[PDB]
Amino acid sequence: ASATRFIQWLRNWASGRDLQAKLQLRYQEISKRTQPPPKLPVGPSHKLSNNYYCTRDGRREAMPPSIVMSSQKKAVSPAPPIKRWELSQDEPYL
Amino acid sequence: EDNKQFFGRHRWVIYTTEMNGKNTFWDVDGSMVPPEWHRWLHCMTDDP
Amino acid sequence: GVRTSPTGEKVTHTGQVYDDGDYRKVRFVGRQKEVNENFAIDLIAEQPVSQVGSRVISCDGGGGALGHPRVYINLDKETKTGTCGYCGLQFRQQH
Amino acid sequence: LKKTTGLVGLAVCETPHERLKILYTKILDVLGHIPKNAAYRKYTEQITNEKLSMVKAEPDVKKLEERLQGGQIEEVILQAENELSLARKMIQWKPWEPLVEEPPASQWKWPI
Amino acid sequence: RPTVRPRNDVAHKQLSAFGEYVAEILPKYVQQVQVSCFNELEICIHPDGVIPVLTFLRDHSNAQFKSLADLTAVDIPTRQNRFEIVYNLLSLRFNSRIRVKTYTDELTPIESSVPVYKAANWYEREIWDMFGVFFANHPDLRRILTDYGFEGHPFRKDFPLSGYVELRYDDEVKRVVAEPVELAQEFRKFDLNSPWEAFPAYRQPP
Amino acid sequence: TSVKPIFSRDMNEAKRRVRELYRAWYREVPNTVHLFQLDISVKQGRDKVREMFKKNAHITDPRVVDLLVIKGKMELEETIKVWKQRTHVMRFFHETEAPRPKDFLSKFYVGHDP
Amino acid sequence: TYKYVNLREPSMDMKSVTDRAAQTLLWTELIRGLGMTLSYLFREPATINYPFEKGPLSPRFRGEHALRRYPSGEERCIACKLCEAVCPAQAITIEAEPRADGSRRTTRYDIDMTKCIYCGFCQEACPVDAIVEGPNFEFSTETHEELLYNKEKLLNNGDKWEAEIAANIQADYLYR
Amino acid sequence: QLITVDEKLDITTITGVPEEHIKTRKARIFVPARNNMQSGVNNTKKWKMEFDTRERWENPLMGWASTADPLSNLVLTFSTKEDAVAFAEKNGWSYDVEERKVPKPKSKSYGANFSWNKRTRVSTK
Amino acid sequence: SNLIEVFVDGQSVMVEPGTTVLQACEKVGMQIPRFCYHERLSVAGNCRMCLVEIEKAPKVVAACAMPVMKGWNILTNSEKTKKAREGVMEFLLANHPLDCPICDQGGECDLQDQSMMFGSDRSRFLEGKRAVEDKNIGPLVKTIMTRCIQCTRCIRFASEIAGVDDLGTTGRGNDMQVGTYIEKMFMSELSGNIIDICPVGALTSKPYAFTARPWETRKTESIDVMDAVGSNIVVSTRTGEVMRILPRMHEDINEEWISDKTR
Amino acid sequence: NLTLNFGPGVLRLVMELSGEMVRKCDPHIGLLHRGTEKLIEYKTYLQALPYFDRLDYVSMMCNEQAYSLAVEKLLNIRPPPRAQWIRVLFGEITRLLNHIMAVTTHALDIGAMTPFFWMFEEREKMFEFYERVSGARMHAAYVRPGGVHQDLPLGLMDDIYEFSKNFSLRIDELEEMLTNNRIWRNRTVDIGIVTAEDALNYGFSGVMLRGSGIQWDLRKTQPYDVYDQVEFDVPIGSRGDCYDRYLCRVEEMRQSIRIISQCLNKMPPGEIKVDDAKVSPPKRAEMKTSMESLIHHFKLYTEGYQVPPGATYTAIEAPKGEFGVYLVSDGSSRPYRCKIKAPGFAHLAGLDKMSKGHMLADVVAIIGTQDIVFGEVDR
Numbered sequence A: 001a002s003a004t005r006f007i008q009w010l011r012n013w014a015s016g017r018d019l020q021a022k023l024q025l026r027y028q029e030i031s032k033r034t035q036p037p038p039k040l041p042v043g044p045s046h047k048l049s050n051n052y053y054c055t056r057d058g059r060r061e062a063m064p065p066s067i068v069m070s071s072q073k074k075a076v077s078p079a080p081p082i083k084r085w086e087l088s089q090d091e092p093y094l
Numbered sequence B: 001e002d003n004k005q006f007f008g009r010h011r012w013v014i015y016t017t018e019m020n021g022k023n024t025f026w027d028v029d030g031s032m033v034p035p036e037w038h039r040w041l042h043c044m045t046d047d048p
Numbered sequence C: 001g002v003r004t005s006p007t008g009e010k011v012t013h014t015g016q017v018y019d020d021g022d023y024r025k026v027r028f029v030g031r032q033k034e035v036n037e038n039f040a041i042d043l044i045a046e047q048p049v050s051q052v053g054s055r056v057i058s059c060d061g062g063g064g065a066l067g068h069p070r071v072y073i074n075l076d077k078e079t080k081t082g083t084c085g086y087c088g089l090q091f092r093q094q095h
Numbered sequence D: 001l002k003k004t005t006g007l008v009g010l011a012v013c014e015t016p017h018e019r020l021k022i023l024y025t026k027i028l029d030v031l032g033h034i035p036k037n038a039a040y041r042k043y044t045e046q047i048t049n050e051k052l053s054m055v056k057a058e059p060d061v062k063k064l065e066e067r068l069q070g071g072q073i074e075e076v077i078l079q080a081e082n083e084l085s086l087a088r089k090m091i092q093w094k095p096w097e098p099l100v101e102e103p104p105a106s107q108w109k110w111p112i
Numbered sequence E: 001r002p003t004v005r006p007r008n009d010v011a012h013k014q015l016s017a018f019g020e021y022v023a024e025i026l027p028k029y030v031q032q033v034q035v036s037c038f039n040e041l042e043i044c045i046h047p048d049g050v051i052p053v054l055t056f057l058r059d060h061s062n063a064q065f066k067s068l069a070d071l072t073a074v075d076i077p078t079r080q081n082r083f084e085i086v087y088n089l090l091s092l093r094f095n096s097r098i099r100v101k102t103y104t105d106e107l108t109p110i111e112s113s114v115p116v117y118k119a120a121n122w123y124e125r126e127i128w129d130m131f132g133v134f135f136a137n138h139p140d141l142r143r144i145l146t147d148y149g150f151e152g153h154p155f156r157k158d159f160p161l162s163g164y165v166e167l168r169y170d171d172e173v174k175r176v177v178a179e180p181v182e183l184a185q186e187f188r189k190f191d192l193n194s195p196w197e198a199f200p201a202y203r204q205p206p
Numbered sequence F: 001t002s003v004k005p006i007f008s009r010d011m012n013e014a015k016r017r018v019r020e021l022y023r024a025w026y027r028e029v030p031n032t033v034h035l036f037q038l039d040i041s042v043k044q045g046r047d048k049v050r051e052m053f054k055k056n057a058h059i060t061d062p063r064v065v066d067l068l069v070i071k072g073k074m075e076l077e078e079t080i081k082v083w084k085q086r087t088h089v090m091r092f093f094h095e096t097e098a099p100r101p102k103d104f105l106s107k108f109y110v111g112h113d114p
Numbered sequence G: 001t002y003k004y005v006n007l008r009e010p011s012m013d014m015k016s017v018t019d020r021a022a023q024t025l026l027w028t029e030l031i032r033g034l035g036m037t038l039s040y041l042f043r044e045p046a047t048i049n050y051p052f053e054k055g056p057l058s059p060r061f062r063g064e065h066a067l068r069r070y071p072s073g074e075e076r077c078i079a080c081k082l083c084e085a086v087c088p089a090q091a092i093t094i095e096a097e098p099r100a101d102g103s104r105r106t107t108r109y110d111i112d113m114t115k116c117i118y119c120g121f122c123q124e125a126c127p128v129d130a131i132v133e134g135p136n137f138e139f140s141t142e143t144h145e146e147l148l149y150n151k152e153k154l155l156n157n158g159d160k161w162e163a164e165i166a167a168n169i170q171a172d173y174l175y176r
Numbered sequence H: 001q002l003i004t005v006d007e008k009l010d011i012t013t014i015t016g017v018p019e020e021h022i023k024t025r026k027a028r029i030f031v032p033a034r035n036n037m038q039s040g041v042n043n044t045k046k047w048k049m050e051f052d053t054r055e056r057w058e059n060p061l062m063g064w065a066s067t068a069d070p071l072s073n074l075v076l077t078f079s080t081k082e083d084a085v086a087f088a089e090k091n092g093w094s095y096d097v098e099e100r101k102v103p104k105p106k107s108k109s110y111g112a113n114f115s116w117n118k119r120t121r122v123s124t125k
Numbered sequence I: 001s002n003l004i005e006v007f008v009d010g011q012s013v014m015v016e017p018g019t020t021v022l023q024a025c026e027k028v029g030m031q032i033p034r035f036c037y038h039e040r041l042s043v044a045g046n047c048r049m050c051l052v053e054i055e056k057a058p059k060v061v062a063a064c065a066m067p068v069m070k071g072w073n074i075l076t077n078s079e080k081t082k083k084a085r086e087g088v089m090e091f092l093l094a095n096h097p098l099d100c101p102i103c104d105q106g107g108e109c110d111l112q113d114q115s116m117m118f119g120s121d122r123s124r125f126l127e128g129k130r131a132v133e134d135k136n137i138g139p140l141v142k143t144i145m146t147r148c149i150q151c152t153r154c155i156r157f158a159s160e161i162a163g164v165d166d167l168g169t170t171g172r173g174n175d176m177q178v179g180t181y182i183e184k185m186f187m188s189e190l191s192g193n194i195i196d197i198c199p200v201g202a203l204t205s206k207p208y209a210f211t212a213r214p215w216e217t218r219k220t221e222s223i224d225v226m227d228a229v230g231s232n233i234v235v236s237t238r239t240g241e242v243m244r245i246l247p248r249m250h251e252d253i254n255e256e257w258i259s260d261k262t263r
Numbered sequence J: 001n002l003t004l005n006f007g008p009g010v011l012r013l014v015m016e017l018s019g020e021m022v023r024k025c026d027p028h029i030g031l032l033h034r035g036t037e038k039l040i041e042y043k044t045y046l047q048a049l050p051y052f053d054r055l056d057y058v059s060m061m062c063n064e065q066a067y068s069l070a071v072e073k074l075l076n077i078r079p080p081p082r083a084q085w086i087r088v089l090f091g092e093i094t095r096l097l098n099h100i101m102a103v104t105t106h107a108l109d110i111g112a113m114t115p116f117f118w119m120f121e122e123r124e125k126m127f128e129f130y131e132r133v134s135g136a137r138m139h140a141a142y143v144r145p146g147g148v149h150q151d152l153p154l155g156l157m158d159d160i161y162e163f164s165k166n167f168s169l170r171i172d173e174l175e176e177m178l179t180n181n182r183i184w185r186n187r188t189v190d191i192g193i194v195t196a197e198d199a200l201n202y203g204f205s206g207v208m209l210r211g212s213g214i215q216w217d218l219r220k221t222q223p224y225d226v227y228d229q230v231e232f233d234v235p236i237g238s239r240g241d242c243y244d245r246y247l248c249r250v251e252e253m254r255q256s257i258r259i260i261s262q263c264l265n266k267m268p269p270g271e272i273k274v275d276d277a278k279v280s281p282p283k284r285a286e287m288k289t290s291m292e293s294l295i296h297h298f299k300l301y302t303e304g305y306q307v308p309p310g311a312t313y314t315a316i317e318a319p320k321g322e323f324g325v326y327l328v329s330d331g332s333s334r335p336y337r338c339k340i341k342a343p344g345f346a347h348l349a350g351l352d353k354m355s356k357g358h359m360l361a362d363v364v365a366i367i368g369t370q371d372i373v374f375g376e377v378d379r
């Protein structure tokens, strides 16, 4: 950021870019190293009522595998065939 | 400090030439920085 | 409370010190035995007993969420103080 | 006619309709050597016949690719070759026969 | 419900239908088909069916599992056939995954699946190295991860964590030597299991 | 009690593979000593090969014999192709191990192990 | 959605073919690359002047361990062994017994700093903020033995660094 | 095609275990006793195999507990004692089997606390 | 022939008349949560952790005490049963002290473990907690009576097993306290067993205090040689040192008890 | 044919050469095998998490995500939306970290050394983002089952925005050095051609597939966290060579910036770990006042949470390809088995196939194009 006008012009010309607008060295734009204290929010289970654990217990809703066939009609695929991808409209080609 | 330098070079220390009876004119160590200044020098805080 | 043994070695706050015939103290020759001089047992014994006007008092160790889990201490016995199990601070009921 | 399939090692096919008609016909030929009640024959004949009807109904390659939903027509040709190769292997394996052996009783029990 | 993983019945039904589809087509080899509560389809097969079942899944037009994601083993010493061999396959055409499992013991060889997937070459070498399962007709079966001359199969449940030998440089012989393992600090085994049951849904009959 | 074999149907064919492996190991020892510049003799190397073979002389299962030959052939390939280094070949001889006591009294003096 | 990174046809007019011939024979795109390194030569470097200048760190930084006290000087650690239990590397070893005043305190608290993975799980698990990873990262030693910390070393680290440790905790404890 | 093998299953020679840790070790096959500190019984379901305890000594430097026993931490889990015994036999380990201890059914009656004429009458609640 | 048919979650079991609901459930491998119930002590029915729904019965029954009737379907995992456990656990923890890090029970605590498995995962208790005076009952058993959950296991053990009526409850309601009332030592050859049966850290071994955590100990099942009874024991060791002695159940010898000398 | 035992991550290559032509390539690995998978069986689920930082030790947080997703699937819980947005944000920062390492060390290996220095100052700035959220520059252990460990410090997103605003210019400078350089193209174009069918059968994934025209990206076809809520393009090659895979990786760096820009704007409020204290530890203030909280904190950090029994294969689109874990739970608080699927394992297994008919110096390029870290290959 302290480079002379000539040196700024020289390196801009050699690179073909406006290097001064996107310097890779950080100056004052960074955020201050001392910040005000946070006050973080709480989750949906922070309630005083209507909040029994048995109604929100994910682990106890897990089940053993469903056995569809044990040793003791239209054809099907594991899922529908995947759909063709669409070419990008942002920039289809490099 | 010089806030016109880029982040990282905007703070520095010039070590004392003697610390706890050890000649440190040429032998400087990063561990000579005491804890209260350590926080400031490493930018863990803004206030010295 | 750093005391030193007859052989000159400092006794730690845990009571450790190599005895006379212990070869292991050779490790300190030409070097030093690192000992912390601030015995927490002697430091907590310096704090005064806090006089309170309730049968039950709570201690979180000070500093709110920066202390220890908050515990409630019964002060019914009058022949001793109530001691916090976490930080060692003492309490006594007034009158 | 497209310049490329976009997949390395997969060449464009100039005559996809004829190529697919030949492969599907070959598949139904090999499937005739499989017992009539084998599930593999019944299912493979059904899906092969469905693809064959599309090929006979749609002269346009791009619309055929849309009906088949198997990617580029060159990908569909390759899958037909894979099915034909598989069908010949099924004749040797005869997987429609009963289970060779039951596992030990606790073989598939988890947790132990 | 914000903290509970949502179910997907459409995928569960699709995978159940395809599981039956496979069982009907290869009854010679399929022993069990199950779909887990998070929608993963497992086909358990007799080990004779490795090549036929994998070939069908790779090549059948209604399957097209062209990618072997992974191949590994699990050691379960309480079983008569202690080693469970697991194949995880991916179908790009149908955007689906499937798991094929079979079994073997210390002395029974499994047919190498390199003919079906070239990916299997190194995976089967690792299984041989770590579990000692031999794969028949492998193009080049040998250790891959352990040191040369290493004795034993480390990933077996009865192989000790720190092994039997350790290395150091010995100045007298001017080379690295192997010696029986001694540890300055023994690894501290922890007994962590709670004596109270956590999951009633998985309780086993007494 | 009917099992799928590895390579051999019975002990007779297993023993044939064992002998072929021994011949390959026996003939390889002179090259190994020279290639790795070992400080043992060819007799010492061939004695070790016999010692390694003899410790398994009690096996009556052709499947166990088959795996032993498979592992022995793997061990030979590593040596012949110089995937092993001097340290790997010389590990068979344990020249930094002090001989552990054998009799009851010697073991009694040093510690508690059997 | 996808894009092609390299699906293009060079033009085959004379002006385009002559453009590519000149690039081949006059090395124009090589000369262009020379321009970019030339531009960097005249940029200010990113190097900082260590040890007189230090790379920036945050209050969460996980450095050398220390054992902390209450303001009274009493040890915070009450030998609960949660840190030992959680330690992924089994780098912590603890023994405890009733102190002469009945207090629940450790008689051994070792951290093998060559087993430690500096993961911070011990300071998460501690219910009393007793064990922390401090801000110091400049404690390399000349011998392996110097990195086997016992309770005396760790208490001395706490007394040495508490001024900075407490300030860092003050900045981050509302995020915990 | 299959073959007939009439031999006892022995894999000691292909496991890589040193000989000293096969012949000299004594495996213990047992169902763990309930930890008397707690009432839960979920840790008494499976069979466990562990090996004989061997020397631990103090590390001169730190006082840590050192060992030279590679199997000091090896504990295996089995659904039945038969599975545990089968695993022990093929690995060459001599073993002791301890039969499962099960609490015997008890006869409990809240009403006996108030017996008219029996000693089961409780003096407090 | 004497057996009656009941159902545990719809699965039939044949039990002897007089079998409690809690015992019917353990015939199908289901362990009902409990605190006051101990199978070797008289039934108390005060903790209420064993409450369980009977199908088509509006009121939850105490499984430890209620005899099972023919044809009952016990719903050990219904919403009513789960809500009953959550509420009782919430009441148990309302006044309990935040002591786990300094409490010897931590890591082998039934209050911790059943709170993890059967209770809620948070607190809505916004008041101050009860705090209780400690009692001195000898050199062997340390008392931290703020941890007591008033299960009366120690009282029943002392009275029935040790035949010593020195333990009782004094006061009433939330102020009810377990102890001796007067300054008295509970010195009996079986006294150390109240440490094991106390579900919480209210009664702990004084010699064992603070030395180890349960997860780090290695259990060696062994035999006692202090007398000729041959009590079955577990020797807890850590890093090559004996830390404590625990009873090992043996129905035909020591049941689940040991003497103070053995312990 | 001449035989050579090259090499002393660390790689040993045994190559058979015929003049200048590689006749065979035999990679000998395991020089960094550290029994991670066995060690994990002695750890609780939380204790095993830091092992995943040290697999592909250039993509630390992506590895954490794959493991956490697998555990959450077995647990039947889900992380809160803000945790999911943080995980996608840092997953794409991690992709930039990896891709910078891949391209520049690929270039450094073949003599183009300067771009390494330019872009590693960019890596150093992203190491700061890692340190500010977790206190560690690389092995953050920040993404955990149930969410993330802590919320972002105030002011971090502002600095990520400032970093991102200028980064595409850094990519442009890297392209000026390599993309049109005839020496770079001579070293990369038509080197290591892999066909679409060979790529699938050999088990390739990621750019090793897309370089050959296969339209596959797990972030699109099998999305996880909030990847279905962001917009981006998948780069696709046409020739399946080293040059096209170089272009794919450079373009993927640009698409990562595009995603990062969306994560910054759409970051929602709320908690950052599942509000279920039987899985995720309670806040420290709760742990020190509420009895239930203290119990659950105590048990989570000693026993750990128990995971319902079952087995899952979970995969993500990691920067090096498909990274998955086959995680088996026996119902306890420690995993029974954890097989790590590392994409570089199958890629390196294809080196012999890919190097056929090439010269010795091409093998260096082909190893670079595969993006090989032996932390994950050897595990």
Ligand SMILES: CCCCCCCCCCCCCCCCCC(=O)OC[C@H](COP(=O)(O)OCCN)OC(=O)CCCCCCCCCCCCCCCCC
Pocket: G024, G025, G026, G027, G030, G031, J182
């Ligand atoms: C009136 C009638 C007059 C008659 C005479 C007219 C003649 C004028 C017209 C002819 C001009 C010819 C110019 C001669 C220069 C050499 C040309 C050349 O060979 O360049 C091509 C060479 C190979 O080209 P390549 O793309 O790799 O492959 C092509 C094969 N299919 O590629 C290369 O060699 C590239 C070089 C590789 C090394 C790169 C490092 C150098 C880059 C910096 C160069 C700086 C400039 C040098 C200045 C020196 C000053 C002393």
Ligand code: SF4
Pocket: G083, G086, G087, G088, G089, G090, G091, G092, G111, G115, G116, G117, G118, G119, G120, G121, G122, G123, G133
């Ligand atoms: S930082 Fe991690 S590895 Fe190091 S002592 Fe703490 S918990 Fe153990």
Ligand code: SF4
Pocket: G076, G077, G078, G079, G080, G081, G082, G083, G084, G094, G122, G125, G126, G127, G128, G129, G130, G131, I101
């Ligand atoms: S440092 Fe903290 S977690 Fe570790 S034993 Fe002490 S109080 Fe417990």
Ligand code: SF4
Pocket: I096, I097, I098, I099, I100, I101, I103, I104, I105, I106, I107, I109, I110, I111, I112, I147, I199, I200, I201, I202, J295
């Ligand atoms: S009795 Fe159990 S719940 Fe209560 S403080 Fe002790 S360990 Fe914690």
Ligand code: SF4
Pocket: I147, I148, I149, I150, I151, I152, I153, I154, I155, I178, I197, I198, I199, I200, I202, I203
């Ligand atoms: S001291 Fe223990 S056993 Fe006695 S009533 Fe209280 S909790 Fe129950």
Ligand code: FES
Pocket: I033, I034, I035, I036, I037, I044, I045, I046, I047, I048, I049, I050, I051, I062, I063, I064, I065
């Ligand atoms: S166990 Fe039934 S009320 Fe206590």
Ligand SMILES: [K+]
Pocket: I105, I194, I195, I196, I197, I198, I199, I200, I201, I202, I203, I204
């Ligand atoms: K107790």
Ligand SMILES: [Zn+2]
Pocket: C059, C060, C061, C062, C068, C084, C085, C086, C087, C088, C089
């Ligand atoms: Zn306090």
